[PDB]
């Protein structure tokens, strides 16, 4: 339980790291979730992408 | 602004604890502007002295 | 993040369309005139001095 | 030739201003993307 007083110990006793944390924490979270949707997608669909076309370079 | 009849700050000590605060007497149509002024000046002691 | 998604989606739809960007580079020809005179010919939406 | 003289006057703003004018225009000049969005804003601004 000692991380709960220590995390309030440092940052939010004023609006210093409040309207800056919620902005910068909106980014690491938006990139943590865009990364996991973009890897559950290319694992459900193997052999179905555009770069998996066997005759791609050669039309002639 | 005449928003009370009387106002008093207290401070009590005991062997392990204590009490710090404000006591006030007022008319029933002044209780909003009186409660704003009490809480504004107690919290200001932590910011701007 | 929800205010971030909505405001960008409304402001980016005003930028430039995929059919406007497809007409942005091509090859056209001119004709001849004598030394010191003026004739223009069109390329995309503007002239060639 | 009045919408050309005024909307290109925002191309002298520092170095985000060449991205302002081609976003206001919707292209590389005044054309049908500009006439269509000038009509939508003109029904809206008298009610503000």
């Amino acid at each position: 339980g000692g991380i709960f007083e220590a995390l309030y110990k440092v940052l939010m006793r004023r609006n210093s790291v409040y309207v800056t944390f919620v902005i910068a924490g909106a980014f690491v979270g938006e990139r943590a979730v865009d990364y996991g949707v973009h890897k559950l997608w290319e694992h459900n669909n193997v052999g179905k992408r555009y770069e998996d076309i066997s005759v791609l370079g050669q039309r002639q | 602004n005449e928003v009370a009849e009387s106002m008093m700050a207290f401070n009590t000590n005991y062997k392990d604890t204590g009490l710090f605060g404000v006591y006030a007497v007022a008319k029933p149509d002044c209780l909003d502007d009186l409660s704003y002024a009490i809480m504004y000046e107690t919290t200001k002691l932590a910011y701007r002295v | 993040s929800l205010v971030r998604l909505l405001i960008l989606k409304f402001v980016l739809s005003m930028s430039a369309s995929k059919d406007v960007l497809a007409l942005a580079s091509l090859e056209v020809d001119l004709s001849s005139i004598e030394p010191g005179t003026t004739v223009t010919v069109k390329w995309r939406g503007k002239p060639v001095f | 030739w009045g919408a050309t003289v005024i909307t290109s006057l925002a191309s002298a703003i520092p170095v985000v201003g060449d991205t302002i004018v081609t976003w206001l225009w919707g292209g590389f000049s005044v054309d049908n993307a500009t006439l269509n969005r000038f009509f939508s804003l003109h029904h809206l601004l008298p009610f503000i």
């Binding site: 210093s16 409040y18 309207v19 980014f27 | 910011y47 701007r48 | - | -």
Partner: peptide, 29 residues
């Protein structure tokens, strides 16, 4: 007191820059 008022108040100028490039990445300037 009054220094700590502004010594706070100029980091919301900067909480707002962590915020001002957070969505738009104003690039050329």
């Amino acid at each position: 007191i009054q220094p700590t008022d502004v010594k706070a108040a100029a980091m919301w100028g900067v909480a707002a820059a962590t915020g001002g490039l957070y969505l738009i990445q104003p690039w050329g300037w």
